[PDB]
RNA sequence: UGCGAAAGCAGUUGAAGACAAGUGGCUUGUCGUUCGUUAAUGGCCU
């Protein structure tokens, strides 16, 4: 993964979340490690809200 | 000189609170928006309105009730192939059914138990339940015909009043009360447990104060009630065996109001504490589990949110909520905590309750049964009427002079002279038993003496007679919505008047030969009309948004090509332009006016080039200025060639939810 | 007059809507 | 007549008036039972808004 | 009319520091009130009368400091959006030169309470 | 001293500010009633001084509007002159007895 | 106020006793005490006054500006003939 | 930021690059970019 901002691993070890930084803005991708069982990525402006982008960058 | 203006907030004429929302078509998600879908507000001082949602929501009709009057629930029934019924209770023991055409109860009919506090219709929209004080459930059989209604049957009898009333389908009928408890009768006839309560359910009590169940509706895609009670709570309840699939502990007050959509992926609920919170089911897991969450929760109102209602088609997903602050919201209803919403303004005059005379620099004002008269100099209170042997008020105007004032309801009308007779007035009744029999909408004053009058069963006297008038053709949506071929506006000067019904149909008249040489010309409903006596013209306005001129005895060149050089102000226009006039100074420049926003167009320049209804859906068929600096506004005229009368308004206790402190 | 002075320079340092009807003009 | 116009509008709009052991009640009108429904009971109306200002919500 | 000579004087372009002299010389409370309500706009009155209360911290007169607490008490809410640039460093020393009084009006009040003791006990002690 | 340790938990903890934000005239004058009584009291002044100042610093133009709480700073402002006063006088017996020593 | 003007004359008159003691703040500690009270916070209300005495005569000048307009500007009114003119039921009757 | 005492005394506030919006440029604003300078109604357990 060739740009991480930030990362978790869930309490298993059977996955791990992080983000990318891909071009606008950055990205949110999941992926399982010991299997090939899932692994999805997505733009975080489509977890964000529509109100977000008009407020400051805390939100 | 320059424009000098006069910003008046001098009328406190004020609506009463949101009360109740209906939404005449049921919402059908996978077809397209119906051209007859109107949303009806029933109002907390007994007046209906009737607002359309193409093109950002115009008020096509207003049903007012008088003194005392108020509506508390209010439901529509439209069989397929019939038309339109429109069916409220008041704080009554009678349920009131309106004809549209009118806009005058054709039908109380009593309900034979006690006070009604909820009402509700059948799905398939044979039957009516009304739930009364007396713990009555009453079947009112409803498909006899628009305006028949019979007794059914009384279900049986309890202690505590029935608050609300839900159907599940033709068979059962679910019923929340006021002593805590959620009653489920059983309305299917011929069984052998007809009428009689299958089960009842209790919420979760309040420890200091009495529990009120305020809001039940059935949720058909899973099998559950949805219910909210008065401490706040939202209980979820399995239909067969009766009983609590999940609560949430929501809202801080009570919950008067909740709703859902088509599919049931989403439960939207307000009330006191004026925030509205959405449960949602959308889920895989959660539609294979019957799991809902407490998805979001917004905070939009000012004081309460007393209903709440929902509309999905294919080209409109919305929901609407208003309360106790007078106006009304509309957010998205798959994208209510992202999406975006509108709060709409507390009045959009589409029928005035104000206006002036340029003689005596003094405007006229009408509240619920009563006018007022002040004069401008500052300005003085010179009279007022109110009349109290009338009930209800409607429409109004002045001779110009300001010699006689005539007001007029759809029951009666009355004419009283007036003599300013210094720092006050003296206002005379002047007996005519024709004006004292007459239904009247609209009356403005041919001459001196001669008015014109439009009766509420479509008739256009002259008085101080009969102006042939012809004959429109029915289609589906004119018998579907049955007003939409009834005389809205009438406007006259010198001799030559012109009406407008709301079909897209605007017909001159001269009111010598009493002919009407027909201009219909037209696609929807006509916002506003104005004649203009310079170029020999009529000027609609429609709903959406489009200044069209054409002359008498078909459009100008100057419509022709204002049309589509029309601003970007108009072309991103929110609020409908609902009053046109011409400048005093100049016979061809012409000042119109919508509820936030004040123009001016050009008679002969043109400009160069270079949350709604919206799908494909029909309409009801089958030097430039502008400012808006005077936002909350009522209504605008003139007075001389130089100054400019602007009319508005200016403002009680909430649910304080409060603002993080630092 | 020096505690008049010390007073007043001390001072010094520790010293360091709508109506119901109104009348205005536009643009004609 | 400061202190008795509301007495005197009220004994003359106000009907139905005794006659010893009876009562004379005049009928209403088909020109206001056929225009308006009829009032509110404000005896349920003050019983719903009072319960939505009860004092245990703290409005304000 | 003095009070109106010293207006012009000082509104036209110049003479400052002789448009205080002529402000001290009729020197109303109410016309010195009024000099202040008048004009719209200062010359950097505030930057001469600074550095006149800097350079005198201990006068005698009272004008040029009832001067500028009445500029402080009126137009406070000009002073400190005027100018940011040199009138920071005005005010930095101008709070620095009044600051010194604060640190000795208890010594002046101690003396004061030692001479009216040795006044009064001289009084008393008259030789009958 | 049970106003003066909640109003010395409100200064010491958040926001004397927070906690005058949505006052007006009739939710002040008991502050500025109790801060008369409480000008007098040397314990009590420090808390009174700066909370006095920070509601005339957020509500100056109350100052112009309402005519009943002119009265009530006229009021304050004749206690502080009292008590300066006094302030004065105090330093004046302690100089008077330094010199003594 | 009134019992300082005792202490002064105290010190005063006494003025050798109490210099040829030899602990004078030891032996009279409770008024060195109670006078470094009162006058420790002379600043703080210096500050008080001066913020307060300023709002004072701002607004103090502010409304002497306009002192004389609300003398005569209440000319308000109430319900007056137009409403004996306006009931019409009593415009029937009387 | 430095020296200081708790007062105060001296110093300020550049550049690059990328992106976003508005009208390939131009303007404005940002930066989980670099170099230099001493410098979202969202509150506390039984």
Redesign the interface.
Known sequence: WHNVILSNISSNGKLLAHMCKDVEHKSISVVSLFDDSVNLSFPLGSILSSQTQSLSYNT | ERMIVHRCRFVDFTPATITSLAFSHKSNINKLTPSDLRLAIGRSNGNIEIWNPRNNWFQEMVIEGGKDRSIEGLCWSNVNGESLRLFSIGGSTVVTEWDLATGLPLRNYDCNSGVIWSISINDSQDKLSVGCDNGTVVLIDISGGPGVLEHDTILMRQEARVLTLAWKKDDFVIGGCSDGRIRIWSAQKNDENMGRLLHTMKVDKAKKESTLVWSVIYLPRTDQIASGDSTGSIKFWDFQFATLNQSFKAHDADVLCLTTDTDNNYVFSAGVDRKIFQFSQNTNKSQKNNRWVNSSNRLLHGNDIRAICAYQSKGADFLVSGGVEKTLVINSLTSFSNGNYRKMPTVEPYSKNVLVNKEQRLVVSWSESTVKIWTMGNYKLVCKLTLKDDQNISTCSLSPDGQVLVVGRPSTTKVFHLQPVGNKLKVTKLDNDLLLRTSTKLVKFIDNSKIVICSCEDDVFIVDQEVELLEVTSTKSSIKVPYINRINHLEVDQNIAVISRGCGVVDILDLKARISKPLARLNNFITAVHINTSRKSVVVITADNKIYEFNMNVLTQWSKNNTDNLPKEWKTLKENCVGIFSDIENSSRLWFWGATWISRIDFDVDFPINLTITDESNFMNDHFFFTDKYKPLLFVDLISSNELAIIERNPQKAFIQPKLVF | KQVEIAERNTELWNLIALPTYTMEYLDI | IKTKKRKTLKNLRKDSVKRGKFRVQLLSTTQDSKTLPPKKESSIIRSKDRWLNRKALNKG | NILSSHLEANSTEILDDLMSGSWTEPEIKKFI?TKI?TVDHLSKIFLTISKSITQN????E?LL?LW??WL???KSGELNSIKDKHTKKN?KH??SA?????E???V???????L??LR??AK?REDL | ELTLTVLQELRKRGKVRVALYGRDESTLEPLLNWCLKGIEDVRSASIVADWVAVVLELYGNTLESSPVLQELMIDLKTKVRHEIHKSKEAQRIEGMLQLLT | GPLNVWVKWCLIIHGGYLVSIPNLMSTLSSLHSTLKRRSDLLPRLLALDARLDCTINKFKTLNYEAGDIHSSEPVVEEDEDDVEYNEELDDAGL
């Open positions: 009130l309500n911290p201990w006068n005698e009272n400091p500028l607490k402080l008490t009126l005010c101008l709070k009044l600051r010194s009084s604060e000795i009006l208890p002046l009040l101690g003396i004061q309470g030692r009216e003791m009064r006990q008393l």
